[PDB]
Each structure stands twice: as C-alpha cells, then as structure tokens.
Design a protein around this ligand. Sequence first.
Ligand code: AMP
Ligand code: AMP
Lengths: 214, 214
Amino acid sequence: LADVAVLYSGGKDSNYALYWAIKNRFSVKFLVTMVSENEMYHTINANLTDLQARALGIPLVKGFTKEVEDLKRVLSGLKIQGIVAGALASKYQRKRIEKVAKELGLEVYTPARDAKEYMRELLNLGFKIMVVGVSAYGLDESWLGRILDESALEELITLNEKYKVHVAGEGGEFETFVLDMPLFKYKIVVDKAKKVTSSGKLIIEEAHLESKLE
Amino acid sequence: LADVAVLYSGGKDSNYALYWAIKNRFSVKFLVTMVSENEMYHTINANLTDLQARALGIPLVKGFTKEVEDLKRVLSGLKIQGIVAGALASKYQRKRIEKVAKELGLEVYTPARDAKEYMRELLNLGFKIMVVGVSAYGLDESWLGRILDESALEELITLNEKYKVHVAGEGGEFETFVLDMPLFKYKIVVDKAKKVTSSGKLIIEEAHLESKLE
Ligand SMILES: Nc1ncnc2c1ncn2[C@@H]1O[C@H](COP(=O)(O)O)[C@@H](O)[C@H]1O
Ligand SMILES: Nc1ncnc2c1ncn2[C@@H]1O[C@H](COP(=O)(O)O)[C@@H](O)[C@H]1O
C-alpha cells in the first residue's frame, strides 16, 4: 500500500506532493505527467518535468491525450496502490482524481489550508520556485521568469490585500516551475527564457542541470 | 499475457520491435527508455523518443541510471507479462534482457536473420530512417543526417562487400532515428541538426511533428 504514483506537472504543488509523499514513508514508484495536444515542438519547454525527473532520479511516466479516460488508462498499467496529488489541486481536478481512483480501486493520498502558511513552508523547505505563468490583474509581465522568496511573498500578500489575487495562485492566478528542492540531486538553471487579459507566459528555451553540494 | 512493454531507444529496431508487437496482436501498454548520465541539457536531442512517443500516442516510461538493476526496477513497477525487444539487440543486451526477464518472471517476446532482407523489409514497410551515429571505417561524416532508401541501401551493401561494414549496423556500425513509420500519427521533421576513429554523431537541435494524411 506504500507503492504510489505522484501526479507530477512540474509546479510548486506537484513537487510539494512529491516531497510530502517521500517524507511520509511512501514508496514513489513513478511520477506521472499527462501531455495534451491542447498545448509538437523540440523545445525543452515540452519536457520540463523530464528535466526535473532527471534531477530526481525517479522514473517518469508520460501519457498522451476525456482526459479522465486517458489518465485511468495510464495509471491502470502501473503496480501501485494509490495516487498522490497535492492539496492544491483544482476543485475540478480533485473530482477526476477521485473518479479514476475509485474506478481503479486506488487510494488518493493527499497532504492534509492557509495560503500564506503554505507558501512560507515551501520557502523554508528550500523550494526554488520560478513563475512561468500569469493570468490575473495586478500581475504584470514583470512577474514572469521571476523567482519567489520572502520578498516576492510580501508583494503577493500586498497584492492580495488589494486586487484579491490568491497567495498560492490557487485558481489560475499564476503557474510555477520548481528549479530546485531538497530532493533534487541536481539544480535546474534557466539559460534563456524570454516572456511572451493580463495573460502572461514564459517559454523556457535553454536550461540545464548542475550538481548540488551533496 | 498480451500486455507488454517495448524497450524503445528510438532507432530502426526498437521501432520494428514496436511494429512487430502491434501487428502480432500484442497489447503494448508502455514504451520504456533508459537514460544514463553516461551521455543534462535542454535540447530535444535528449527527449527524441519522447518526440516519437507523441507521434505514436503510446505512454512512455523513462528510467534513470549496473543498468540491469535499474531496468528491472523500472519494469517491476509495470503491469505487464512480457518484454518486447528487437531481434537485433546487442549480443550483450540480450543477456541483460534475459536476466531481468527471468528474475521478474516475464516473457521475452522478440521477432523471430539476414541483414539485407531485414533492411529491405523496413523500407517496404514505409520506415523513414535517419543516420544519427557512425563508428566504422568507410563511413564518412557525410552519412550523418542522411536518410536511408533503396539508394543508400546499395551504398551500404557495396561498402559491406569491401570494408565489411554490417548492413544493419549490427555492432555499433551506425546509430539511427526513425522519423516516420506506419504507426506514427505524426511525422518527425528535422529543422536543424549539424554534425560533430571514424566516429560521427548528429545532434538534433530543432525538430517538430507534422500531421500525416491519415
Ligand atoms: N495528470 C493530472 N491529473 C490530475 N491532476 C494533476 C495531474 N498532474 C498534476 N495534477 C495536480 O496538479 C497539482 C500541482 O499543480 P502545480 O503546483 O502547478 O505543479 C497537484 O496538486 C496535482 O494533484
Ligand atoms: N533499456 C534497454 N535495455 C536493453 N535493450 C534495449 C533497451 N532499449 C532498447 N534496447 C534494444 O535496442 C534495440 C534497438 O536499437 P535501435 O534500432 O538503435 O533503436 C532493440 O532491439 C532493443 O531490444
């Protein structure tokens, strides 16, 4: 029952879900990423979680796509007992997870919910988070490619207590990409990104792994 | 017993093994690629089989690494009955496959061996094969990035009946990458490659998928 697969899309919560699972003695046999044609090229920006999976040394399973049926199809081919998803999964995402899980007879392990507290915990845990998506007023394109720290957290809280932008970007406020965390054996360094409704998006063009102190 | 995983590294034989398996009514649940640090960047040249897996629509499992222990670890997490490998696997490769297979209690399905005949069959089946590796005298860097056809086959046979270079590159003579085959839903187009003992190597920098007639 310790054998599980983590739904990994690359952002702060997928990574927190991974850290949580490992710390709670779970046996993460696989990371699972679903790729939809809804978003074809050679750029690394297509295999970002693939870059993180190498930093982690953990096997990565990639599915392709009614995404519920495709997900269940992928997960059904794995020798696992449960599915690990972050406690910040979309209100809709949780429904799909619950549905496929039940139908497959799998457990839905999830971290047992204050935005501020959560965000602070990630920083204290050594999470290196970069903003790669933005879709909320009060967040100019300047936020793209920017890393979050005790400083950026303030600006988020200050922005929240004004434009009411979620502190944990819960709801599409902004997308993230984790460049480093305690479990990474290698750090991810962005060499070239270049930025593109107040909808922003950072397309990573050049990136590489760098060994950590260890 | 129909459920299997194909050891897919991207070349002509991995793809032939895949085609053979699908045609023989096997249920290919996953493609498995092992990535070793023995060969760190963002280039697509790292996720080439990932590009093919999208063209195929088949889930891809990627392992990281005694590669035998790592392979068995990956395959042990999949709900399969056997392993599919091409009949051209290295004389050593077959030993590892047999070892892990036996230890996991899995079947080792493999295509039931004339080089010329084999190479001709691939062309007749519509295989679009590009040379991305070279390590044999009589094969100048001009062969890198070159596509194989009834014409290139002759030059290979003519070269064989002289420098004794294997027709199926069996033994490290040359590495390949399949840009298209009947099972691909999309074709792979190389936009920018640039070439690098008579050891040659083609590093693909730009590539993309293009829809097929269907
Ligand atoms: N294939 C998937 N299906 C459903 N939910 C997913 C999938 N992949 C990732 N997630 C959820 O996405 C959340 C993380 O989003 P993020 O912080 O941007 O990486 C996690 O809490 C997961 O539960
Ligand atoms: N992870 C692996 N372990 C052992 N053999 C492999 C692995 N991946 C691919 N192969 C073998 O590599 C052969 C294909 O080489 P190629 O034609 O260059 O793609 C196949 O016949 C497979 O049996």
